[PDB]
Amino acid sequence: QVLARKWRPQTFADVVGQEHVLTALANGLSLGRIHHAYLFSGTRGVGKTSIARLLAKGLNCETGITATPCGVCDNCREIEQGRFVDLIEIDAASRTKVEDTRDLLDNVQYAPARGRFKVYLIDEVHMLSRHSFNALLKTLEEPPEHVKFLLATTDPQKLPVTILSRCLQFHLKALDVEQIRHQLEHILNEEHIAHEPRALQLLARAAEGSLRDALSLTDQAIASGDGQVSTQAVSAMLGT
């Protein structure tokens, strides 16, 4: 049980920053105003896949479509561990799985098994092979009612305008140092873990906008200097 994992957002509410994206998805889920495809854009580390998964969670919670998924039903618990059957996770950026991808994209499992929606989460989507695009391109045109597409990319422009014009796009932003620092302090207090001021500042300046890496580092700092988050440990982990 490490901070990076233990502090994974369980609801839109737990997310730091991105006010506009959270409001649009929360309200959207709360209003039954749901689109066919969503496009999450931003630099690596802004939480693009983290927010898309919370969306899938909210979309499939057994209690119903909601912005505040219960987190205790099987869909929620499984979706949270990326072991859900209606949440097909794809990595277009890796050649290790190019085989199954192209397949799944035609093999659009048109009908959920246990969830009310079948969800495809495609990370680094602009990297899909000429093949996966075209089928994907074809589906966004004529979209199955119980199927949704959650796309993530660090490079929106590299996508055809035919996919761009068919997706509601969410522009995730990097956090300033204070938002990261404040969260870090709040986390360590809840955890009853000691921390020096400059130490958290070094950790936040270091994170470079990402709260996900802000946490890994803190963990890789709580590990170095044994016990607490002491300034020497931190600048020592930032090492040499």
Ligand SMILES: [Zn+2]
């Ligand atoms: Zn649930």
